[PDB]
Amino acid sequence: RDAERLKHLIVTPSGAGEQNMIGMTPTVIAVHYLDETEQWEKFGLEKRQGALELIKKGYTQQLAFRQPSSAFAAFVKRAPSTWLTAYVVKVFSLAVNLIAIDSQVLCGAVKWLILEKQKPDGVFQEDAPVIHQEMIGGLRNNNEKDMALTAFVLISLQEAKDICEEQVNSLPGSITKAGDFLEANYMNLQRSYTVAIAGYALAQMGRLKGPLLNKFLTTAKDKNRWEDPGKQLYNVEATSYALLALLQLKDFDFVPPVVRWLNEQRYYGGGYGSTQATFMVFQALAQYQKDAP
Amino acid sequence: GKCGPPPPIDNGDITSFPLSVYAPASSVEYQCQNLYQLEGNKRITCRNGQWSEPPKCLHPCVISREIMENYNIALRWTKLYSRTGESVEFVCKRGYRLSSRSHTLRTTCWDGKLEYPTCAKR
Ligand SMILES: CC(=O)N[C@H]1[C@H](O[C@@H]2[C@H](O[C@]3(C(=O)O)C[C@H](O)[C@@H](NC(C)=O)[C@H]([C@H](O)[C@H](O)CO)O3)[C@@H](O)[C@H](O[C@H]3[C@H](O)[C@@H](O)[C@H](O)O[C@@H]3CO)O[C@@H]2CO)O[C@H](CO)[C@H](O)[C@@H]1O[C@@H]1O[C@H](CO)[C@H](O)[C@H](O)[C@H]1O
């Protein structure tokens, strides 16, 4: 996917605690992807400096919406969102090798999630939904919500693990308990989106196996995509999570048609309600590039 | 007289970030996850190069609809999880009455144990 088709993802973030992350998202992942696929020399190595500055600005502006709890919401006076806080953790984690991320911000957010928003059976719960529902991709109006949100938060926790494990020793047990919940209910899932996202979450822990692994694989259409009737952006997102799961499994046999389908979408990110699609497709393709022979 | 890192506890963590080494008289506090009940002192202190006893996090209880159906009971009012120390009130389903050996219809969660009452057919 060619840098010139993605140049529009480099943008100045603005707005409050949610919209700022909507803006930070495409820039972060564009840089991540261009780094991995080494496209900077052709596209213009001068431009990377400006992108990193835009990412630092996003980070810095987001800190105005960090509450004393270490959680985030659109506004300092709005109750904190479980989803938004976990999204910040996912984004800041992937950016730790682009700019300086204060580990107390990141690991504080992680610890809040664990201590306040995890239920005894491992489920993560939202008590203050984001205002801009379009930013949450295929989680929106999903009826399998406990599994979908539990997977989402769990992925974030896993992506923060290396950085926060030592400072937050409740992290591994929290991660395990969420996994329990996902493992216990995975077989009953109906929606491909949920199957994909929870699948990646379990694969990161090496707990996608046996029948669950088979359900994961067999849920694909034509061995190349995970899809449900509805917004196509949800399927791109879903399939991106699936690809990441496959990379975790190192099932490099299954991968190439999936990458092909994602590539054939010619999805270049950035539009309305595109925050999750944009982050996930480029995360997944970047990882594919990094791991492929 | 320094202490090393504070101990881990299940289903909880400290409210600060942990250090390699702590001065004497230092203290840190624990917090349990949601619906887990802190037992013992939340605070531990470094005295003579040793931490005081850390607390525990007492488990809540899951309320099982399957067991309720099996035991011919239902909730008197209408909450899937109960804190340690918190109670749940059941009733016999219609046409059933308390067993002779049965726990009371009002029953309390203690550290993950909940005794369900059982009702039998009249
Ligand atoms: C909320 C309340 O009034 N609590 C007092 C309680 O009242 C009983 C029912 O509340 C509980 C319960 O203790 O059994 C509260 C539990 O947290 C709930 N457990 C879970 C897991 O959610 C249970 C559970 O919902 C039910 O047991 C399910 O069957 O309920 C309360 O709901 C019930 O309310 C009735 C009311 O009695 C009736 O007149 C009206 O028409 O309908 C209401 C429901 O729609 O009343 C129950 C009493 O029989 O009773 C306890 C002691 O028996 C306390 O009085 C409790 O108040 C707390 O007391 C503490 C001191 O011991 C402390 O001061 C707290 O501040 C008080 O809230």
Domain ranges within chain B, ordered by starting residue? 10-59, 60-122
Resolution in Å equals 2.2
**Tokens representing B85?**
């120390």
Q: Which fold has domain B10-59?
A: Complement Module; domain 1 (2.10.70)
CB contact (8 A) between residue B18 and residue A117: no
- Total number of domains in chain A: 1
- B10-59 shares its CATH topology with B60-122: yes
Q: Which fold has domain B60-122?
A: Complement Module; domain 1 (2.10.70)
Query: Domain of A204: which CATH number?
Result: 1.50.10.20
Angle, vertex CA B63, rays to CA B59 and CA B69, nearest 5: 150
B58 → chain A, closest CA residue = A120
The DSSP element (H or E) to which B51 belongs, if any, is: strand B50-51
Using CA of residue B9, residue B10, residue B15, residue B16, what is the dihedral sign? Answer: positive
For residue A20, the enclosing domain spans 1-293
What are the CA-CA distances from residue A245 to residues A239, B23, B26 (Å)? 10, 45, 45
Using CA of residue A26, residue A268, residue A270, residue A128, what is the dihedral sign? Answer: negative
Among the partner-chain residues A104, A120, A173, the one whose CB lies closest to the CB of B60 is: A120
Chain B within 8 Å of A115 (Cβ-Cβ)?
yes
User: Who contacts A36 (Cβ-Cβ below 8 Å, separation ≥6)?
Assistant: A286, A289, A290
> Which of these, A102, A99, A85, lies nearest to A157 by C-alpha position?
A85
How far is the C-alpha of A181 from the C-alpha of A16, rounded, in Å? Answer: 33
How far is the C-alpha of A140 from the C-alpha of A162, rounded, in Å? Answer: 29
* Residue A293 contacts residue A39 (beta carbons within 8 Å): no
Give the 3-state secondary structure of residue B57.
strand
What are the CA-CA distances from residue A11 to residues A83, A94, A279, A284 (Å)? 23, 18, 14, 21
Strand pairing of B27-32 and B12-14? antiparallel
Among the partner-chain residues A116, A119, A167, the one whose CB lies closest to the CB of B18 is: A167
Ligand 1 centroid vs A115 CA: distance in angstroms? Answer: 26
Chain B neighbors of A170, CB-CB under 8 A? 8, 11-13, 33
Count other C-beta atoms under 10 Å from residue B109's C-beta. 24
CB contact (8 A) between residue B11 and residue A115: no
Distance from CA of B120 to the nearest CA of A (A): 30
Technique used to solve these coordinates: X-ray
> Which of these, A81, A227, A217, lies nearest to A149 by C-alpha position?
A81
User: Contacts from B100-106 at CB under 8 Å and sequence distance 24+?
Assistant: B105/B73, B105/B76
Give the 3-state secondary structure of residue A115.
helix
